[PDB]
Design a protein around this nucleic acid. Sequence first.
RNA 1: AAA
Length: 460
Amino acid sequence: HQVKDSLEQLRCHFTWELSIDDDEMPDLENRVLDQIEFLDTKYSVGIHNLLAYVKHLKGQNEEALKSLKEAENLMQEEHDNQANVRSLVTWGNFAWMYYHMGRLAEAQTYLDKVENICKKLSNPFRYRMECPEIDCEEGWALLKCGGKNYERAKACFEKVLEVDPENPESSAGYAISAYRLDGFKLATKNHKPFSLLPLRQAVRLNPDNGYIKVLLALKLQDEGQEAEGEKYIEEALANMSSQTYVFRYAAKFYRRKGSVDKALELLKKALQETPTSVLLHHQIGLCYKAQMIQIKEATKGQPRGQNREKLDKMIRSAIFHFESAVEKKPTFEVAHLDLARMYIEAGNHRKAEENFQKLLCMKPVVEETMQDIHFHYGRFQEFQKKSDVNAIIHYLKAIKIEQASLTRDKSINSLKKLVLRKLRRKALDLESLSLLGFVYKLEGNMNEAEEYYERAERLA
RNA sequence: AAA
Ligand SMILES: [Ca+2]
Ligand SMILES: [Ca+2]
């Protein structure tokens, strides 16, 4: 069992516990292909090795070898024929591939190549190479393979920065990881911008990286500094580096600023390049949603004639794009939520219900998203289905997810309003009395709360 | 990637 034990010591995709879910594999493959074609970075070894690992997981071992060979061919050019330690990721993935294919003599050849380099560099381990380049490669792999991996990704880049605080590559990976982790918490009470300083430093150290600049812009916009952010949007848009990705985030920036037409123009250009992007399809849908709201506001909710034809175009176009996003990535929870909400605007309550029911069964990486799912389903039950019983159930389920947030507070307020309404129609509704006590208790008004709980008890 |  010497071979297998040696393979487990290698640092490469096979030993990084990426845990790629089958339902996310088609989207991952498309994102990997998009990145190969459109992300401008110095070394593309990592991304080709991830494509090989994906092909392996698909049962296409011969196709996987092709991607590992391409990774070696490209390394020759990106380092000018010179030796580079990132090759050890490729060689580790060859050893695993050949082991899985039964080409065991070749698997041993690649273990020997790795060992030879670990010796040459005075690495303490025989097969496990300890160098910052490989910590970064582990981090980028994790960062590409979904939100559940982002704490691990950040820690890979942080390990490099603890020894070399001005390392450009790990500064970039740390900042992007941190930005996405901040995104997960953006609606939680008293959230803080942990990623802002990392992004400033990553831009300083990677001055040609437009991708990092547009994330810095968006975090500045989050923090109420939109004009400073817009300067970075403009600098990124003047750069060709990773242009199509720059367009995605500039489009988000302009939509949030209120320039929805500008956002749509950028997204339509980006969709020409990466038409399978679920991020693009969701962003385009949000733009049509924003335009729908603008039409509603100008016509006081009663568009007619051409304005009605325009509203319906916005609704149907948003449904098309949200449906496109969730076809491609069925685990994209918030896109299903936007879709359910847009089916309410289209007057299709059965399709809204269907998507809410799907959402109730999901297990988001971001557990607080289920507050939003219950809250919006509760509102649908209250206002479209005229079911106070089911509205109460789902406002309570939102509240029971204790994390303080904008939506938990809205759920408390919505439950309060519903119960106050019921009590006007029937002041001796014991259930409503107790719920109103519960609401006051959650608000901290302990005397009002016990008053209502007591009143409810007396009746019974 | 909603918020
Ligand atoms: Ca390019
Ligand atoms: Ca190729």
